[PDB]
Design a protein around this ligand. Sequence first.
Ligand code: ATP
Ligand code: ATP
Ligand code: ATP
Ligand code: UTP
Ligand code: UTP
Ligand code: UTP
Lengths: 559, 559, 559
Amino acid sequence: MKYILVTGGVISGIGKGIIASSVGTILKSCGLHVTSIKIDPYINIDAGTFSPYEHGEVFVLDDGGEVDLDLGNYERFLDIRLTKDNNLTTGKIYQYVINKERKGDYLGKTVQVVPHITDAIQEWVMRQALIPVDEDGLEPQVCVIELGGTVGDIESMPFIEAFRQFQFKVKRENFCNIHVSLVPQPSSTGEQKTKPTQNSVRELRGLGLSPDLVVCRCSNPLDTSVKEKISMFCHVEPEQVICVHDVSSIYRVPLLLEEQGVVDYFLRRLDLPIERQPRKMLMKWKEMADRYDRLLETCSIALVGKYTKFSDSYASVIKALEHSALAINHKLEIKYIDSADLEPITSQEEPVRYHEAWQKLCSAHGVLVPGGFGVRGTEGKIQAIAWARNQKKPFLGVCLGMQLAVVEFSRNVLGWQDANSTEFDPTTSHPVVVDMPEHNPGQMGGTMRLGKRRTLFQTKNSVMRKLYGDADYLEERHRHRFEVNPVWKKCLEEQGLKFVGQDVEGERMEIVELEDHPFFVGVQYHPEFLSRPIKPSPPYFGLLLASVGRLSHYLQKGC
Amino acid sequence: MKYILVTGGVISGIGKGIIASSVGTILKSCGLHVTSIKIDPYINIDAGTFSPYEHGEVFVLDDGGEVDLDLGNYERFLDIRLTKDNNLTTGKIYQYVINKERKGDYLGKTVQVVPHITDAIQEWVMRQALIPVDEDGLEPQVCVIELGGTVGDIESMPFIEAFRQFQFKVKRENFCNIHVSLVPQPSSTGEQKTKPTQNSVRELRGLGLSPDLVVCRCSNPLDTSVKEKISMFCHVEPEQVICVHDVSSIYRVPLLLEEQGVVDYFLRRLDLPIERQPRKMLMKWKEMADRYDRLLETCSIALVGKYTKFSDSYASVIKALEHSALAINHKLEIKYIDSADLEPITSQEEPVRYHEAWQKLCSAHGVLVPGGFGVRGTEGKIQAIAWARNQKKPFLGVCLGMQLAVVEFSRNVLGWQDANSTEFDPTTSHPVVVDMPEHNPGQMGGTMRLGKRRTLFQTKNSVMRKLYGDADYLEERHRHRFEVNPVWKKCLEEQGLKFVGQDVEGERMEIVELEDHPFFVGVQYHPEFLSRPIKPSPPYFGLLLASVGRLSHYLQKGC
Amino acid sequence: MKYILVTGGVISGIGKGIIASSVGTILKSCGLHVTSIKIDPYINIDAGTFSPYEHGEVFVLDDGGEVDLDLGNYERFLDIRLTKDNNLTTGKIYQYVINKERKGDYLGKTVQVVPHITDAIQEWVMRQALIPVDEDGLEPQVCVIELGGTVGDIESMPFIEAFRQFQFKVKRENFCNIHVSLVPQPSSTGEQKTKPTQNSVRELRGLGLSPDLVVCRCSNPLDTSVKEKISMFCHVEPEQVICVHDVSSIYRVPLLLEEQGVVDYFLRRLDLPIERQPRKMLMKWKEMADRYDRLLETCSIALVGKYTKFSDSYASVIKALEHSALAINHKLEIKYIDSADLEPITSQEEPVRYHEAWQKLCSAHGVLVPGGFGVRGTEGKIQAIAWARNQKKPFLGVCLGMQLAVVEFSRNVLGWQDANSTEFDPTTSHPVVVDMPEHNPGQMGGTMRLGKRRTLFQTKNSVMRKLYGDADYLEERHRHRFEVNPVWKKCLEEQGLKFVGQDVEGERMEIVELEDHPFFVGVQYHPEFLSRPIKPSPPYFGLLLASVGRLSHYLQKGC
Ligand SMILES: Nc1ncnc2c1ncn2[C@@H]1O[C@H](COP(=O)(O)OP(=O)(O)OP(=O)(O)O)[C@@H](O)[C@H]1O
Ligand SMILES: Nc1ncnc2c1ncn2[C@@H]1O[C@H](COP(=O)(O)OP(=O)(O)OP(=O)(O)O)[C@@H](O)[C@H]1O
Ligand SMILES: Nc1ncnc2c1ncn2[C@@H]1O[C@H](COP(=O)(O)OP(=O)(O)OP(=O)(O)O)[C@@H](O)[C@H]1O
Ligand SMILES: O=c1ccn([C@@H]2O[C@H](COP(=O)(O)OP(=O)(O)OP(=O)(O)O)[C@@H](O)[C@H]2O)c(=O)[nH]1
Ligand SMILES: O=c1ccn([C@@H]2O[C@H](COP(=O)(O)OP(=O)(O)OP(=O)(O)O)[C@@H](O)[C@H]2O)c(=O)[nH]1
Ligand SMILES: O=c1ccn([C@@H]2O[C@H](COP(=O)(O)OP(=O)(O)OP(=O)(O)O)[C@@H](O)[C@H]2O)c(=O)[nH]1
C-alpha cells in the first residue's frame, strides 16, 4: 500500500480534497486500485449532526454513513465506494480507546498519545488499508489520506507523530508526503508571497515531516524567480514546487497536474510502473474540458431557500445541475434567492430586495425549492411554489420543498388554508406533514430515514419513471423524517396531485408528480448524491430540459 | 475561592503533592476551609485499575472512589473528606463531553479544545469549587489544585490554556501560580544547576503562565548566589525563590515553609487576613518534630511479598506503621523480603539470597503479609506464615495474607495439604478461598467488594475489639473479592482459628484471630487508609506492641 | 570526511567533551586521521578573557590560541595539534559576516540566518575539515564536532539548521548524530528517570535531527527494562541506547565504550573498514587501567590559592599531577586550602578554619602556589611560601606564586619587608614584580606574554635542566605579564636565589631555583598544558618526587 498523505497549512479551504480527488482519479487512470481515508481532527463524531450552512452537505454513504462531501467528491472522481470506515474522527477514537480502557485491554494502565493512540491510529490506517473499495476485492494499491486540520493545530498533532513514525515502518517508497500550502497575493501589491509557505513547511519539517511534493495554491501562476526562491527556502526541486493556480473549474486541475507531470514524479518516487497511451485520460478530461470551453444560452434557476444565502451548502446540488448542463451543453446561472426576500415582511423592510427577488424569480427559467431546516422563509418558499405552479414554471421540490408543495396544494386547491406542517405548527387543522420516524429495534425513539433505500414506482405512467428508464424501482439517497399524512393523501387521490413513489412498505411517499403541469415534481430522496457527470440524475436533467422547453422533444426524440 | 494551582516541570515525583499537602494543612491552620482538586492528565479513568507496583496504593475514598494516594495524603494532612469529584481525568472528560456531543448539547457542531474543552475544564473547577469538604457545608475558601503532568506534556496543555484564561476570569488575588521545579546536583561536580528550572519556567512563561512562587526541589539548601541567579533568570524575588531542600521526612516541610515565610507571602499575595498566635501550628508539627528527633530501639518488620521489591507500593502502609512508631516512640526498620527469596527455588538459584531472606525474617520483630496480586511467591508467603505461626511471631496478614493464612492453617492443622485458593487453583480439593463477588443490580457479573463498609464483631472476646475500644462494630476500607468458603469455616469453628469479624450479612469474613498465639491476626479490610498520626489504626499499633512485647502490659495498663 | 556531531541536552557538564575525547582516541586507535571542531555558542570571542573560576583553564594552543580546555583534553587523548581555527564562536562569526557585509559581499542585501549564516557555518565546517591536524598533511578522515549548548538554546539553533541540511549535503554515512543525555536518579527514590531524555530527544527530533547513538549519562548502570523503555520511547535499538554510568575516572570510559561495542556500530554506520588485533588499544588503556586499579601511599599536596575553592579551575593541573602519580604509582590527595584561611584575618574570624588550614598545610607532603588573579590571599600565600621555605617543604610556585616567592625572599632574606608587587601596590619601595608587557607592532599598548615560547637555560647546573634531560633550551606554554625587576635581580645574584631560565632576549625570567633547599622552584610558564600521561612534565613529577623523598635517589638512579 502506498500511503500518500495529504497535509496542508495556512488556512482551511486550501483545496486538499480537491487535489486529493484529482490525484486519486489520476491514479485510477494509471490503473491503481485507489482508496482513501479522510481523517477529521473533529472531536465530534457523525457529520450528520453538523449544519449544512456551517459546512455543507453531509454525504450519505451506501451504509448510511453521514460524512463529509469530499468523500462524495471522491466518489464522483472514482467509482470506488466508501464506507464509514473511511472517515475517522478523534471523537470516534476517544470512545473506541476508552472502551478498550474499560475492557482492561491496557491492563488498566494509563494510555498515552504515544505510544498508545498513535499506535491505534496506525492500526486504523491498516484497518482501512485492508478494505477494498472496488468490485475487485483486493487490498487497494494506493491510499490517499486527507488529513484535515492545518499544520499547527493541536487537533492533528497526534497524527503527525503517528505518521512521522509510520512512514518509517513502511518503506520510503511506500509513503508520500503531500503538503498543500498557499501563495497569497495582495491586490494592493500583487506580490506573490512565499513566506507563509515557508512558515508552514518550516514548521512541518520541525515536526519531522518533509514534503515530497508541495502543492502551492496560487492565484495566477508563479513566475520562475518565485519558484526558485521556494526551491531554495524549502530545499526542494522546482519540479517539487507545484504551482496550482486558481482555475475557473476543478476539472482543470487534473489537467494542470498533467502539465506539471506530477504523475511521472510519483512513478519515480513511489517506484511504480505504468503502462500507458497518452499518459492518462486523456480524452476523458480533455473532451470534457473542450465541452466546458465550448458551451449555448444561459439557463437560470432560482434557488429559493434559507441557507441559500450563498454558501457552498449546495455545492453538490449545483454540481448535479452542472452535470445536466454539460449533457445538454448549455450554460447555467444559479440565482440565489433568499426565500425571505419573497415575503411581505421584506416588502415592509426593504421593498427593493422584495421586488428584486421576485423579479429575479420570474426571470429564472426554472425554480428549485430544496430541503432545508427551520421555519424561516416558509412563507416565501410556499409563495414561490404557488407562483411556479400558477405560472407553470418548472418546479422541483426536494424534501421540505416537496412537503411544502403538498401543503400549498392543499391550501390553494382544497381550500385548506390552515393546512400545515406539524414540523412547525403542532396546532394544525389539517396535519399534512407529519413526523413519521423509523422505529428500529435497539433504538430509543424514532430515527430519521437515512441511507440508500429502495423506492417503488406506484405506476408506469410517470414522467420520472420514463426518465429513469421504465424501471420498476429505484434506489436513492434518503435523509428525511416527516411524511405525508395518509389521512389526507386519500383526499389527494381524487386530485391531480399524484403520488408516484413510495417506500417498500407502501407507506412513506417519495415521489409526487403534479398532473397537467409542464414540470412540477417533488422528491424526498436526494438524487444529487448519486448524480455523476456521466450519469446525471434525472430530476435535475429533466428540470433543465423543462427550463429549456426541450423535455417534450427529448422524450419524443427517444429519451 | 482562591485558586492555588500547583504546577511543576522537569520530572514527575518532584513533590507537587507533598508541597500541596504541606500548604494545605498550613492553610487549614491559618483557618481556611481548604479543599483541593487533583487533575490527572490520564487518558484512563479509575486509578483502581492501575498496578500498585506501577504507581502505588489506590486510595479508597468514602464514596468508594478509586483514586491516587496523594488524596489520601491530603486526608492525612487535612480532616477534609474527598470524593470522586475531587479527581478528574481526561478519560473522564472525554466520555463526559462525548456524551454531551451525542446529546446535541453542542448543536451537533464540532467541539474544540478551545473554547469547548477549556470551558468544560473551568466548569469542572467550579463544580468542585462549590463542594465543601468539611462538616462546614460552606464553599471552601481556598482550592489547591494539583495539576499532574509536567510542563511540556501535551496531556496537560488543554489545562494550561483553561487556567491561563481562567486566572483572568477570576481576580488576580484569587489565583496563585505555584511552580515546582528541580535543582539537580551532580555528585561528580556538586554544582547546583538552575538551567533546568530556567528551561521549565521559561517554557511556562512562554505558555503564558507566570509563577507567583517557585518551589525549588533542592538537595541541600541553595546558596545565595544561586538564588540570586535564579531571581535574575526568572525575574522573581529571592523570596519567591523557595528552596525546599530534601528532608529526612515530609513532616519537616511545613516547618521549612514556615521558615520561608511563604504564608506571609500568601497573605500579601492573596490578600488574606490572618489571626494568629504563633503564626501557625505550632506545637502540632513542632512537637511531632521534636518527637521524630527524639526517638528507642529499632523494631523491624518483615514485609513479605511480591511487589515488596522496594517501591513505594507500601508508602501508606509504612506510614501507618510510622504512626504507631511515633505513638510508642520507637524506631522502625522496614525489611523488604521478596517472598520468592523464601522459596526453595531461590535456594536452588541463589542460596545466598535464600538464607539471607530467612535470616532477615528471623531477625525481624514482627512480620507482615499484606495483600497482593499474582500467584508468585505464594509458597514463600505461606512458608513465612507457617514460620511465624510456629515461632509465635507477631503476624498480621492483610487480604491475601489473611486468605493464605487460613489455607496454611488448614494445610498444617487440618492436614488438608491440598487446601488451596481457587484464585490460583481451580482444581482444589478443599476450596478454602473462593471467589465471592458482589452482585449489585445494574452490574453485569460480580464486582470486587470496595469502599467503606461496616464490619460487625462476632464476639466481645476479641483482642482487636479491645484495641478498637469495645466497639460493637467498625467501619473500614474494603477492597477484596475472594472470601472464606463457609463449607470449611464450619470445620474451622471447632478449631482455634476463630473468625471475629463479619460483614453485615454475616457472610463474608473480615477478621480472624488465631487463639493461643501472642499475635496472629488477619484482616480483609484495609485500615492503613484510615490510620492517622493522631489516631493510629490498631492492627498495626497492636502488631507493633506485639513486636515489642509490650501489648500485654498495654492492655493490662489500661489500653 | 565523517562528521560526527556531538550534541546533548538537559544540562551542561553532561560530558560531551569527555565522550568526544574518548571516541576521538578510539577512532585514532582504529587508525583514522581524527580532527575536531568545538563550536561554542558564545557570543563572545576569546576564552582567554573568561575567568578561570567561572569556567576553568584557558588552554593555550600552539598558535597562542586562547581556548577551552576540552581542546587540550583532545590533545591529551590525541597527539593532534589544534589551532584557533578549531574553535569558533558566534561572536567570531558575527564580526566575520559583518565584515563581509561591509565589503558588499552580499550585494548590500540583508543577510539572514538562513540561508546566509547557516551557509557560513557549513563553510566553516569545511574550512576546518580541510585542515590536517597531524604531521600527515592529509584531510582528516573524521571530524568530531563538539557542539556546545544544550538542545533548546537559541544560541545553538542556527547550527541545528546548518547541520540539519548539511547532513543531507553530505552522505548519510558521512554524518553521525551523537546525542548525549542524562538519566537522573533521585536519592529519595533511586528511580532512574528517562523522561528528561525523552524530552530532549523528542525536541531534537522535532528540530529535525535524529540521533544515531544516544549517550546516556547514567549514575549506575541502567537495567534492561529502562533501556527497553528508552528504546521504545526513542524508537532506537537498545544497542543505540548507550548507558555510560559514572566512572571513578575518565580513563574508564573508552573501555566502557568498548564494552558497548560502539565502534562496531560506527563501522557499520559510517561504513568504515577496520584492521585490527584486539579491536583497539588494548594494552594502552588496559594497562593504565590496571595501574590505576593497582596503586602505594597517598601523597598529599597543598593547593594554596584563591580560586582554589574547589572548582575545576585546576583540572589540568591536578591531571598533570595525576600523570606523575601514575608514573610513580602512588596515590594522590589534593588539599584545597584557601590561602585566605592561612591569614590572621581568618584567625580573627574563625580560628577553627585558620588552624585547620595550617594543620592541613603541615600535613601536606608538598605545596603548590599556582598563578592566580587578585590581591586576595596574597598574605596567606606568602606566608605559606615562607613556611615552606623555612620548613624545607617541596615548593612549586607558578607565575604569581613564583613572583610572590621572590618577593617573600626579598622580604625575609634581604630584609626588604616593603618589597612588593606593583601589580597590587604601586607605591612600592622595592618594586620586585613589575609590569613588563610585550609591545609588538600593530598593538596599542602592551600585551600579556602568551603562547609557546622558547626559554633558555642560563646554566647547566640546574635541577630542572637535569629533569628535562640536559636540554639547552625548552619550549613551554606562556601566559603572564609581570616580570622580575632586574634592578633587584642584580641584588639577588649574589644571593642563593638563582635564576635559571630566561626568555630568548635574556630579559624575562622564567625559572628560579632556590639553592640549598630540597625543592623550592618557581616557573612562569605553564607546563601543565604540555604534560601528558606518557610524558609528564617534570616540575610536577619532580615536585612529587620531593614530596615523596625519592628525587635524590631518582636522579642518582639515573633520572
Ligand atoms: N485550484 C483551485 N481552483 C479553484 N477553486 C479551488 C481550487 N482548490 C480548491 N478550490 C476551492 O476551495 C474550496 C475548498 O475546497 P475543500 O473543501 O476541498 O478544501 P479543504 O482544504 O480540503 O478544506 P475542507 O475539506 O474542510 O472543506 C472549494 O470551494 C473549492 O472549489
Ligand atoms: N522535600 C522532599 N524531601 C524528601 N522527599 C520528598 C520531598 N518532596 C517530595 N519527596 C518525595 O518524592 C516522591 C514523589 O512524591 P509525589 O508523588 O507526591 O510527587 P508528585 O510530583 O506529586 O508525582 P506523583 O503524584 O505522580 O507521584 C515521594 O517519595 C516523596 O516522599
Ligand atoms: N562518565 C563520566 N564519569 C565521570 N565524570 C564524568 C563523566 N562524564 C563527564 N564527567 C565529568 O563531567 C564534568 C563536565 O565535563 P565537560 O566539560 O567535558 O562537559 P561538557 O558537556 O562538554 O560541558 P563544558 O564543555 O561546557 O564544560 C567534568 O568534571 C567531567 O569529569
Ligand atoms: O519594517 C520591517 C519589515 C520587515 N523587515 C524584514 O523583512 C524580511 C522579510 O522579507 P520578505 O517578506 O521579502 O520574505 P521572503 O523574501 O522570504 O518572501 P516574500 O516576502 O516575498 O513572500 C525579514 O528579514 C525582516 O527582517 C524589516 O527588516 N523591517
Ligand atoms: O562546550 C560548551 C558547552 C557549553 N557552552 C555554553 O555554556 C552555557 C551554559 O552555561 P551554564 O550551564 O553555566 O548556565 P547557567 O549559568 O544559566 O546555570 P547553571 O549551569 O549553573 O545551572 C551556554 O551559554 C553555552 O553557550 C559553550 O559555549 N560550550
Ligand atoms: O499527579 C500526577 C503526576 C503525574 N501524572 C502522570 O504521570 C505520567 C508521567 O509518568 P512517568 O514519570 O513514569 O514517565 P515515563 O514512564 O515515561 O518515564 P520515567 O518517569 O520513569 O522517567 C504522565 O502521563 C502524567 O499524566 C499524573 O497523571 N498525575
